[PDB]
Each structure stands twice: as structure tokens, then as C-alpha cells.
Design an enzyme around this catalytic site. Structure first.
Site, PDB file in Angstrom:
ATOM      1  N   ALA A 101     -14.936  -6.999  -6.243  1.00  0.00           N
ATOM      2  CA  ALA A 101     -14.097  -7.382  -7.379  1.00  0.00           C
ATOM      3  C   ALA A 101     -13.425  -8.740  -7.165  1.00  0.00           C
ATOM      4  CB  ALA A 101     -13.049  -6.285  -7.689  1.00  0.00           C
TER       5      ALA A 101
ATOM      6  N   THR B  72     -29.527 -13.341  -3.173  1.00  0.00           N
ATOM      7  CA  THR B  72     -30.353 -12.136  -3.069  1.00  0.00           C
ATOM      8  C   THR B  72     -29.510 -10.936  -3.433  1.00  0.00           C
ATOM      9  OG1 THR B  72     -31.537 -13.251  -1.330  1.00  0.00           O
ATOM     10  CG2 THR B  72     -31.806 -10.755  -1.475  1.00  0.00           C
TER      11      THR B  72
ATOM     12  N   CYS C 205      -3.203  -4.073  -1.935  1.00  0.00           N
ATOM     13  CA  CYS C 205      -4.273  -3.084  -1.742  1.00  0.00           C
ATOM     14  C   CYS C 205      -4.786  -3.066  -0.280  1.00  0.00           C
ATOM     15  CB  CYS C 205      -5.465  -3.304  -2.703  1.00  0.00           C
ATOM     16  SG  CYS C 205      -6.553  -4.714  -2.352  1.00  0.00           S
TER      17      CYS C 205
END
Ligand SMILES: *P(=O)(O)OCC(C)(C)[C@@H](O)C(=O)NCCC(=O)NCCSC(=O)CCCCCCCCCCC
Ligand SMILES: *P(=O)(O)OCC(C)(C)[C@@H](O)C(=O)NCCC(=O)NCCSC(=O)CCCCCCCCCCC
Ligand SMILES: O=C(O)CN(CCN(CC(=O)O)CC(=O)O)CC(=O)O
Ligand SMILES: O=C(O)CN(CCN(CC(=O)O)CC(=O)O)CC(=O)O
Ligand SMILES: *Cc1c(COP(=O)(O)O)cnc(C)c1O
Ligand SMILES: *Cc1c(COP(=O)(O)O)cnc(C)c1O
Lengths: 126, 84, 395, 75, 395, 84, 126, 75
Positions: C73, C241, C327
Site C-alpha cells: 500500500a 516483473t 502501524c
């Protein structure tokens, strides 16, 4: 707090408590600020020859602040008032192996020693 | 004191036997060849300390082989064209 | 040595065993590059990538074409905020977000200000919730993007995402939400909520670290300038990739969460109420940060007056917790917490695998050690002697 | 293709022409094997004849005949 | 159905079992966030991250402080090229690279040109190797960066990295090399080679997909403007949660490669010579693209005249290979390959786990199917009838 | 035709017995509780097709449990504080 | 080439070869360019009633080009010259299930049919 | 703490006061168990007494006494 040396001052507390602020032989140092996350109260009891015979502390602060002020309280016992003046923030940090981000803790504990010793010294002048 | 020669030859057999159980062709063929080449490359080491280091690395790699053989059997797939 | 209880799921989660099981074939024999077009290692890797894309899309109500895989994120937030800002910069220079966003949103916005964009950092109410009418008033004619996170990572508060979407859609302003702490835990539907971009983190939802996604709405089309240059993988939006085992793990975590969300919410709600109620009935001067009426129960942020938070975490030596924690917390400051209480807050996380026994152990040790640290605290001593701390001249 | 496919295995493993793989020959003293070779040779006989040869038996298989004998005595 | 042989290691590699073994504890019980500072899941995760950092550093001769983890060499190339360009842009606006770089270098440079930077794309010789004296001549007073890859992903050619470092250091121009195809396969030492930045990809060296690193020299200090905004992880150079299991796998792959490099090079050299020699002695009109004197043997790019490459890959139905391939080819064009021959080239990859039997099978099928496709080819028919293809008026 | 009730009760016992072998406390306790709650939640389904779908999902999850139990034993760690 | 339908024209080749370019009853279409990666040669043999009775091809190109031109060669057999003119690139693509990136292959195969038919038609006028 | 810890296990598992766990009671007909309960109850007896109870024996343990009897007969 990740050091064994620091945690020991919380898991095995020593000299936590209070002395009588009204005594002419007690000096009280109260340093730091709640808004800064670190408040140290350190009190010393001095005999009539100028030897510190006892000390107590209370600290609001991280583990390294508790250990720094707890160690300072142990270290002043048995020292004269003039000897206690030579305890340095750097000796406390060295003993506790404080990382650089916690060095402000050992400096506040040195401030607490000197505030206590200064409060005692102010009471002896009369 | 443990016998370095006995440890070594027992480890050699164990590591070859376990590597032959790799389900996947490219890990199996590599492991068998690499074990043979490495023990032969190190045959003439004489320093007892260096031998012990090599033995300890081989014991570690035997644990790796045992675990990765089992994991490769739990998640196996079809053989390659050339295994027919 | 015995291991501490994990009560820190907002920082990261363990893999769900179903997720590791789905990943392992791609770590062992299905190791092809999903962009290899001419052989079966590529084909089977591509197919697993596209199945995972559909799994992510199904959880949030999107078309799989709208799902772009990223490394987390953090990357998704950078793409949404900088990518939209830079795309529309010829006509639009103003962005809106809030003061309690995760650091990657805030720092992305700060970097754009150094680029000549104007950014409004909306305050929040003391509840932690934005004021919708203040958001409406802040929108300008050259506002290109509003970004407001769905669930806050420190205090757990839920922003009114659907009502924000109504505001933004009606004014043709793009709406981005950082949903890292919400995906798979509360319902998300990009059309009902009128979301234009969304950030997703795999390792907050029992998937592996190092993977995420960004939802980018295709109708009405939202345009984003790509940040990572390369050969055009992920529709030109994220060259590089695509890491098949990790995106397989992300899709599996999304499918599992879609199935488990209702069950987990019921169970975590009960454990969360138990934790909060049993701490508060046993300790005075404990305050919850954030409005419990608009709050995801698995994230509980409490302040323990007269005790410093890091010392409490040290005292809770066999519980893994967090404090001041991405977090002195800027989130707690933004909701108006007194600075000293903000130094006294810690975060408890309850997740899919947490047991009642873990909760009860954590509660019991927290009560014991708050009492102990208060008995060591000069601030508690002074209050017990009837001193007004707000009357002292500190330093 | 009698059970002295044993000879073929020994010759293949030790790089020795079939003519020099005599029944009396010991692997080490007569055919140039070291103990890494003899580990591999015992496993090659295990594979070829679908037989498990444990350590106390393997240590006795030091000659061509001993190999021949062991395999004939285990089906 | 039986599976094809994997002969495509320049596109990606299987995990080495030693690497998956090192990763699995971090996918099962050691799942902490390495940035969680207050508990043992964090501590043990941090410690594994830092051990992996040292493993990467040891392989390339760096200080671990110089190793920044990323999601892949694509991200590392963006950070090196855009990060250096943007940092020094007040005094330096010119960058140099080459026409055969990987697409993420080239596209990063193209994005900077749209930003107002000047970029020289050096040609290469027909060998694939740059001309050192043309590099020297291209450096300007405001040149901030030279970027030249160590091993080319399509044709395997080795650039004279140490001699480029001598040129750049002597002129105080930063030197970046994309080493994705070289790390762990040929010797790399950042001080002997005078490298300032280096890109590393985990999944080209038997590590997992989704991870990479960037070496950034600390003495003399190289400065880079960070691209991904956030809370300052990786020394402020790459914000985001560091994915412990993946960086553990990268460090393990580097340590294994440090141990295995010499053995692999000997073995792959022999297999590569066997493949090239046995194809060329059995088919006419086969040409190797790239100078074999300055060439990593595990990457073999050959043209088969009068046969189109994709049809040959189709014909080699049980071998996984690649053509025209970014790990009509712009690399083949840059080395002066005729356009028709460039349509006739395919790439064979030999790696750590390739067997002689695989090589021989691949050779035998390649000989058979080149012959077959030539017998279906109107171009071969015309040449066999003595027609000069260069005399026909096509379309 | 197979007996749905027999499959179901045999799967229930098998899935509980295997989940109890999880080395890790949080997976073990979750798996046992989740299996109990899910079979009880689905007790009153009557559609034979929907029952068969649920049974097939349980067989798939039993394979997951078996593999993840074994992998968790290969890579086990110390118990948690509260298992003392 | 990933489709079964496309690969079949290489694994099971049919009508690969050549006809006699000097025949008045043979038309030869040669289209594409080596530099573009796709060259198709398609030849048709027409009987004296105008029915195509045989055809051969050779193609340099990807699997979809081989299949498109191979299918075109099958499809012209049995058609009159005028019928063969109505074979469309779209019918070839549909039969082979060509993805959009390979549609240029079916268009070249239609070009090859028309070039062959035009070469034959030019030979009949005298 | 006699081997009618069996009673304690049955009462705990089925939510039934120890007074109502009579030797004659069948789990289903008398104590309100369904067949999910009885799977769990058999496993709880296996755990408590370190005993493995296979299917053909488990199907016979349908009453308190049958449980008591089985456990006394397997040490
Ligand atoms: P024999 O002829 O009586 O004796 C043979 C030995 C080797 C025992 C004899 O020569 C001796 O004693 N030499 C002394 C030196 C020595 O012991 N060398 C052996 C050391 S152990 C060693 O080299 C192990 C190397 C391990 C390689 C494993 C590669 C694994 C790869 C797995 C990947 C998944
Ligand atoms: P008994 O009282 O005679 O009979 C009990 C049953 C359930 C057999 C009876 O009520 C019945 O036949 N009901 C018919 C409906 C039915 O069969 N329901 C059961 C379907 S199977 C099911 O629900 C399985 C759900 C699987 C959940 C597994 C969760 C795993 C998690 C693992 C994570 C690592
Ligand atoms: O030891 C080895 O090199 C590999 N194998 C043999 C590899 N085989 C493939 C197979 O066994 O299916 C070689 C092959 O068939 O090409 C040994 C074994 O069977 O245990
Ligand atoms: O079934 C369960 O819920 C978990 N365990 C018991 C969990 N235990 C921990 C342990 O067995 O060490 C509970 C505890 O001790 O807290 C069953 C089993 O032992 O197989
Ligand atoms: C974890 C988190 C992030 C960052 O996600 P990563 O996948 O770790 O990059 C962003 N926003 C919030 C709210 C988060 O909780
Ligand atoms: C594979 C590769 C890359 C990209 O690396 P990722 O880790 O896949 O992002 C960059 N340069 C070269 C030369 C490569 O071979």
C-alpha cells in the site's frame, strides 16, 4: 527497552518511593515535563556530616528514563554532596549501554541529581 | 572425540540417498551432482578445523535437503519431457 | 525461551495457512515469469496472476481490469496521489487529504507541495472523523484529488467513505481511499462507495509482505501518470516483473477474507468489547482514543494517565503491542489529545487468530503493570496528594 | 544379463574395462577405488537390483565376488 | 501432461532450495514487521533483515550501510537514474547510458527527457560492447550520471565495468550499473570497479520474485533523491515495509551465489560451449549475436537464417526459451543485426540446475526443427535456387 | 451414491484431529474453533447440491491443514508464554 | 503460438511445397517482406474449367502466419477462381481463433490468395 | 477423580449438570447431544485418557456407562 540492564530497574525495582520534603536534610529534584514524556523526582537524605545516607525516586518516562533515574538514585548513596555533584550523564549512559536516541534520559537523570543537591544546599545556608 | 572420516562417509551416503528423493528433476540432479563434486573437491583437506567446518556445513545442508525434499513431495508436479 | 503473545496485527499479520498453501507451488515448481509469453512456465504463471487479480477484484466489487499489482500500500498510495496529481496538473493543482493519514500519504502530499501543488490537510474532529461539510467547503475549482483513509491504523476510526464519494463524484473530483486497514475486515464496494482509487496491502490481511494493489476505476475513466518506468507491465501503470507467488498470496488472502469477514467481525467485536470493558472497569483514568461509534473493533488505542506508554510496553514483557505507532503521535495530536496523554497511549490489535485467553492474559497484565508504573510515577503521586498538575511550572 | 550385471555396474562406476573386473578383484586394492567411490558403488548396486544394503552388510562388500554373492542371496 | 525443459533463466530462475528453506521460518512463525521496535517479533525480524543486508554487501564488496532493499531491479534502476538526476539537477542536467540497456533504464531516461534532462544513448559496437573512448568523449561538464549494465539480458555481452568506473571516477561523474544479470555469476567488487550505484534483482539469482536491492556508495558520498514517499524506512531512501521473508531470501541467494559462483561458471561454460558448438556444426547459417570474447556463457542468443524465431519457439514445443526478448529486438538492431535476422533469433539460458541431457535434448530438437522450418520457408527455397534475397522488391 | 452424512461426520473428526496437530498455538486454536463453528453453522442446510459444495470445500481444507501442519512442524518454534 | 488450432498446421503439415511457376495454369502469390518477419508464398493450380484443383505454400513467419497461409491453401482447393476471391482475412482469423495481435497474419494470407489468383488471371488473357 | 472423570468430561462437553449425567443416560436421547457433539465428546475422552478410540469402537459408545466401561478396559 531491549537491554537487560535497563529492564532490570523496572523488574527488580529499588529505592522507589519518597522522602520528607520538609526535612532540612532532604533535597528534592523534580525535572522534566509531562508533555515531554519524562518527569523524574529524585530525593536525597544527607546526614549531619554531609554524606548522602539514602535516596528515593519516582519517574514517569520510558524504560531508559526509569533506569537512568533509578541508577542515579543508587549511585548517590554513600557519596558526599560534593562527590554526588561529579556524577555525569555520560557515566550513567555508559553503565546502562544507552543508545544515542536515549541519551537525553541520562542527561535528565544528571539534572535530577543536581536539582536535588541544589535544593538541599539551599536549605543549609540558614 | 568423533571420527571425522566416519561422519564424512556416513554424511556422504545420507546426503546422496536423501537427494535422490527430490521429486523435481532439476533439484534432484543438481543435488546429487553437487554433493559428489564437493566431497571430491574437498577430499585432500588436512586441517582438522577446516574439516570440521565442512562437516558442519554438510550437516546443515542435509537438514535443508530433508526439508526441501518433503516440501517438494507435498507440492509435486508432472515429470519433465525428458524423464520419459 | 517462551514467546510473547502477538497483539500487534495493525503493524502486520501472520500468513493465513490457506494463503501460504496457495503460494507454495509458485515457490517450488511454477516459478515462471508471468510475462514469458512463449512457454508453459509463463502461461501457468500468467494464469495464476490473472486468477489472483479476479480474487482481489471480487472482494471490492471491481472489474479485474481495474486491479494493478504493486509492492504494498505504500507504493499504491504514491501512485494514486502523485500519479493523479501529475496527470491533471495542466488544469488542476490542489489536493485534499486529512491530518491523520498514514505517513506515505502525508509525505507524498508534502513532496507534491515542493513540486508546486497546493494541499489542504483537513483537521479531524476529536472523534477522529472528518467533518463532511468542511470537506465540501475545501473543494476548489482546480482540486484534482481527495484522499481519505477508510480505517485509521493507530486508532481504528472509520471515515464516512461512501459519503465522501458522494461529495467527490458530484463535483467531478477523484476520490482515493487508503484501505490498507479495512480490506477484508469491513465491507468495501467501489461503486456503492463511489471510490475512484484504492490502496490495498497484502500483509495487513494475512497475506505476504512485499505485495499490494491499487484499484483504478475505468468507468468513468481515472487517469494516472505511471511512476515506475519500464516495459509497460500492469497496463503501463506499474512496470516490473509481477511477482507471481506474492500476488497469488494476495488473491488468496482476499478470497479467504471475503469468506471470513462476517465471522471475524463478530468474533473480534466480542473480544474487543471484552478487552476494553475489562480494562476500564479495573483501572481509573483510562480513555479510548477515537469514537467507538465509528470504529473498527480490532484496533484499540487507549491512554493510561500518569504512565508513559513505552514503559508500559516494556512492563508488558510477554505481549507484542505498539505505541505512538505508525502501524509523540501526530494522530493523537490531531484529535486534540493532551501531549502528556499522547505519551501515555498504546495500541492493542485483535485479529483473526486471537484467542479469548490471549485477551484475558493481556488485560490482566495491563491492569497489574499500570498499577505498578503508577506507583512508581511522580505524576500519580502528585494527583493522589491533590495537586493540580496543570498548576506546575515544569522543566 | 545374468546377475553379473554386477560386473557391468562395477566397471561403469569405477571406469574400468569389463576385462579387468575379475571376480577376485577388490575395489580399492585392485580397481583404484577410494571410499567415496565405494559409497557410490554400493548405492548403484542398491538402485540396479531394488535392494537395500545396510551399513554392516555394505562394509563387507569389498570385492567383485562379494558384490555378486550379496545380490544372488537377496533375490 | 509432461512438462517442458526450462531453458529460460534470463527471464527468471527457480528458487534454490537453500533459499526457500531460509525463507520459510519467516513465512510461518517469524512474521513480525522488522520496523516494530517494541517486541520480539519485531526484533527477530529486524535481525534477519540486517543479516540479509550483510549477505548482499559481502557478495559485492560493499558496507551493509550501502545496501537499500527494493522490490526488484526495475525499482532500483528507477531510484538510481531518477534519484541521482533529480538530486543534482540544479547543477547537472545531462545523463549518459547505452542503446542496449534494459527497458527500465531506457524508459527512466526517456521520462527524464520529458523532465528537461539531456540524455545521450551511446551506440554499441557490433560486438555489443560500448566504445570506451566514445563514452569518454560524451561526458559534458554538467553530466551527472553514466549508467551501463554489467551483463546484457538478451545477448549476454559483458561491458567493461571497471574501465567505465575509471573514466567516471576520474571525472567525478557518478557511475551506475544495472547488474541484474551479473550478480552472483561473475565477480563484482564495487571498489575495484569504481561503482557508485548498482541494481540487483533477487529472481535472476535463484531468489524470490518481488525483491531487489540498490547499492548506493557512501564514500565518496553519492546522494539520491528518494522516489517512494513515506515514513523513512531504508535510511529515507525506500519508504515502505521491508518484506522480511523476501529480503531473507535475497540475502540467502547472495550468500549461496558467493559460494557457488566459481563452480557454476565452470559448469555453465562447458554446457554453453557444448550447446553452441553442437548447433553450429550441424546447421549452416547460424550466427551468434554478441562477441563471445566478452560474454557471460549462460546467455546464448543465436540467429537461424530463413526461419522466423517465434515459429522455432513453437516448434520447440517442449523447451521453454525466449525470443526478441526483454529478459523486433532493439538490442539486435543496436548491434547492427539485419532486420530479417533479428526476426530469426532466439535466446537459450543455461543455469545452475541445467543438465547436460537438457542441453543435448535442446540441441537435437533445435537442429531438427530448424531444418523442418527451412523446408517450409520460401526464403530458404529461393536461396537454394541461387536467388539473391537482397535483389527482390518486397511487399 | 456416497453418503453425505458419513462423509460429513468422518471429515469432521479428521479435520479436528489433524488441526490439533498444528505446532503453532494461533493456527491450532483457530482451526479447531473454526471447524466446530462452521460445521455447526451449516448443520441445517438441506439442498443436496449445496451440501456437496460444502463437503468439497472441507476436503480441500483438510488437504491444506495436513500440508500446513507438516510444514509448521518442519519449521517449528518455541511455545507462547501462555502455553506454560 | 498457444492455440491447438494454430500449432496443428506446423505439427501436421499439409500442402507444403511448390508448383511449376512456368505453367499457364499455376498462379503464384509472394507477399510480405523478410524485414517484417512474415513472407508467404501461395501457389494454386487451376484446371481448364477454372476450378482450383491443387495448391501449395511456403511461409517464413510466426506460427499464426504459417497456420493462416496453410489454412488458405487448404481452403482454395475445390473453389473456382471467382469463389476463391471471396475468402476473407476475417474467415481465416475466425477459424483459427486468432487474437487481435495476430490479425495481420490473416490479412497477409488473404493478400497471398489474391496475388496468386491475380498472377493466374494475368496468364489467361493471351 | 476415579475413572469417572468420564462423567466430568461428558457433563462439560454437553452442558449438563453432573447430577443429570447418570450411568444409564444415552448422549443423544437423554442428554441432548447431536452427532457433532458426539464426535467432539469421543475426542475429548481420547485426549483426557491418552487413548485412541477407533471408529468401530466409537460407534458403540453411546451412553455414559459405555464410555466408563471402554476407558476402564483400556488402562
Ligand atoms: P576414503 O577414500 O577412505 O575417505 C574419503 C575421505 C573424504 C573421508 C578422506 O579422503 C578424508 O578423510 N579426507 C579428509 C578431508 C575431508 O574430510 N573432506 C571431506 C569434508 S566434508 C565435505 O567436503 C562436505 C562438502 C558438502 C557439500 C554439499 C552440497 C549440497 C548441496 C545441496 C543443495 C540443495
Ligand atoms: P448428526 O447430528 O446425526 O448429523 C450432523 C450432520 C451435520 C451430518 C447433520 O446435521 C446433517 O446431515 N446436516 C445436513 C447438512 C450438512 O451436511 N452440513 C454439513 C456440510 S459440511 C460443512 O459445513 C463443512 C464446513 C467446513 C469448514 C472448515 C474451516 C477450515 C478452516 C482451516 C483453516 C486453516
Ligand atoms: O540421481 C540423479 O542424478 C537423478 N535421478 C534420476 C533422474 N532421472 C529422471 C527420473 O528418475 O525420472 C533421469 C531421466 O529420466 O532423465 C535419480 C533417481 O531416480 O532417484
Ligand atoms: O484444540 C485447541 O484449541 C488447542 N490445543 C490446546 C492449546 N493449548 C496449548 C498447548 O497445548 O500447549 C492451550 C494452552 O496451553 O493455553 C489442543 C492440543 O493440544 O492439541
Ligand atoms: C500498512 C499500511 C500502509 C503501508 O502498506 P505496505 O503494504 O506496508 O506498504 C499504508 N497505509 C496504512 C493505513 C497501513 O496500515
Ligand atoms: C530482470 C532484469 C531487470 C528487472 O529486474 P526485476 O527484479 O524483475 O524488477 C532489470 N535489468 C535487467 C538487466 C534484468 O535482467
Amino acid at each position: 527497552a531491549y537491554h537487560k540492564k535497563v529492564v532490570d530497574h523496572y523488574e527488580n525495582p529499588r529505592n522507589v518511593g519518597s522522602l520528607d520534603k520538609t526535612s532540612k536534610n532532604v533535597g528534592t529534584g523534580l525535572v522534566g515535563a509531562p508533555a515531554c514524556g519524562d518527569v523524574m523526582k529524585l530525593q536525597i537524605q544527607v546526614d549531619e556530616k554531609g554524606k548522602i545516607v539514602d535516596a528515593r525516586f519516582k519517574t514517569f518516562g520510558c524504560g531508559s528514563a526509569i533506569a537512568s533515574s533509578s541508577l542515579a538514585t543508587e549511585w548517590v548513596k554513600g557519596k558526599t554532596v560534593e562527590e554526588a555533584l561529579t556524577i555525569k550523564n555520560t557515566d550513567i549512559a555508559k553503565e546502562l549501554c544507552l543508545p544515542p536516541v536515549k541519551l537525553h534520559c541520562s542527561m535528565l537523570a544528571e539534572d535530577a541529581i543536581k536539582a536535588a543537591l541544589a535544593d538541599y544546599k539551599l536549605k543549609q545556608e540558614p | 572425540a568423533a571420527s571425522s572420516r566416519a561422519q564424512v562417509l556416513a554424511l556422504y551416503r545420507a546426503m546422496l540417498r536423501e537427494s535422490k528423493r527430490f521429486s523435481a528433476y532439476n533439484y534432484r540432479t543438481y543435488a546429487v551432482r553437487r554433493i559428489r563434486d564437493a566431497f571430491r573437491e574437498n577430499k585432500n583437506v588436512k586441517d582438522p578445523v577446516e574439516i570440521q567446518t565442512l562437516v558442519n556445513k554438510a550437516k546443515r545442508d542435509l537438514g535443508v535437503i530433508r526439508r526441501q525434499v518433503h516440501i517438494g513431495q507435498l507440492y509435486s508436479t508432472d515429470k519433465l519431457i525428458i524423464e520419459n | 525461551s517462551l514467546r510473547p503473545l502477538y497483539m500487534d496485527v495493525q503493524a502486520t499479520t501472520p500468513l493465513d495457512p490457506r494463503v501460504l498453501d496457495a503460494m507454495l507451488p509458485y515457490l517450488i515448481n511454477y516459478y515462471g515469469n508471468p510475462h514469458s509469453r512463449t512457454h508453459a512456465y509463463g502461461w501457468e504463471s500468467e494464469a495464476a496472476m490473472e486468477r489472483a487479480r479476479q480474487q482481489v477484484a471480487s472482494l471490492i466489487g471491481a472489474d479485474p481490469r481495474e486491479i494493478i499489482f504493486t509492492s504494498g500500500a505504500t507504493e499504491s498510495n504514491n501512485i494514486a496521489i502523485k500519479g493523479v496529481a501529475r496527470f491533471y496538473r495542466s488544469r488542476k493543482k490542489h489536493l485534499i487529504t486529512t491530518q491523520t493519514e498514514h505517513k506515505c500519504v502525508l509525505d507524498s502530499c508534502r513532496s507534491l507541495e515542493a513540486e508546486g501543488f497546493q494541499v489542504t490537510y483537513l483537521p479531524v474532529q476529536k472523534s477522529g472523523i472528518i467533518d463532511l461539510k468542511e470537506l465540501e467547503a475545501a473543494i476548489q475549482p482546480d482540486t484534482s484529488l481527495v484522499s481519505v483513509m477508510t480505517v485509521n491504523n493507530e486508532i481504528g476510526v472509520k471515515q464516512p467513505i461512501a459519503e465522501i464519494g458522494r461529495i467527490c463524484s458530484s463535483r467531478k473530483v477523484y476520490f482515493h481511499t487508503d484501505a490498507a486497514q479495512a480490506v477484508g475486515k469491513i465491507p468495501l464496494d467501489v461503486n456503492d462507495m463511489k471510490i475512484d482509487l484504492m490502496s490495498i496491502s497484502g500483509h495487513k490481511i494475512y497475506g505476504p509482505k512485499g505485495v499490494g494493489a491499487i484499484y483504478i476505476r475505468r468507468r468513468p475513466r481515472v487517469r494516472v501518470e505511471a511512476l515506475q518506468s519500464g516495459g509497460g507491465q500492469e497496463r503501463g501503470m506499474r512496470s516490473g516483473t509481477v511477482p507471481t507467488p506474492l500476488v497469488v498470496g494476495l488473491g488468496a488472502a482476499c478470497e479467504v477474507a471475503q469468506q471470513e469477514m462476517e465471522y471475524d467481525h463478530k468474533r473480534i467485536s466480542k473480544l474487543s468489547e471484552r478487552l476494553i470493558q475489562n480494562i476500564m472497569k479495573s483501572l481509573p483514568d483510562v480513555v479510548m482514543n477515537g469514537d467507538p461509534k465509528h470504529h473498527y473493533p480490532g484496533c484499540i488505542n487507549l491512554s493510561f494517565a500518569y504512565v508513559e506508554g513505552e514503559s508500559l510496553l516494556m512492563a508488558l514483557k510477554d505481549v507484542a503491542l505498539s505505541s505512538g505507532s505508525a502501524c509523540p503521535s501526530y494522530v493523537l495530536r490531531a484529535i486534540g489529545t493532551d501531549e502528556d496523554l499522547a505519551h501515555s497511549s498504546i495500541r492493542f490489535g485483535i485479529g483473526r487468530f486471537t484467542t479469548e485467553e490471549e485477551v484475558d492474559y493481556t488485560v490482566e497484565k495491563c491492569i497489574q503493570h499500570v498499577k505498578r508504573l503508577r506507583e512508581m510515577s511522580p505524576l500519580w503521586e502528585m494527583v493522589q496528594d491533590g495537586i493540580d498538575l496543570k498548576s506546575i511550572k515544569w522543566t | 544379463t545374468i546377475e553379473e550385471r554386477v560386473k557391468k555396474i562395477i566397471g561403469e562406476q569405477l571406469g574400468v574395462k569389463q576385462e579387468e573386473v575379475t571376480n577376485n578383484a577388490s575395489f580399492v586394492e585392485d580397481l583404484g577405488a577410494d571410499s567415496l567411490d565405494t559409497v557410490e558403488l554400493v548405492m548403484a548396486l542398491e538402485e540396479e537390483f531394488d535392494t537395500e544394503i545396510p551399513d554392516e552388510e555394505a562394509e563387507k562388500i569389498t570385492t567383485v565376488q562379494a558384490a555378486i554373492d550379496y545380490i544372488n542371496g537377496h533375490q
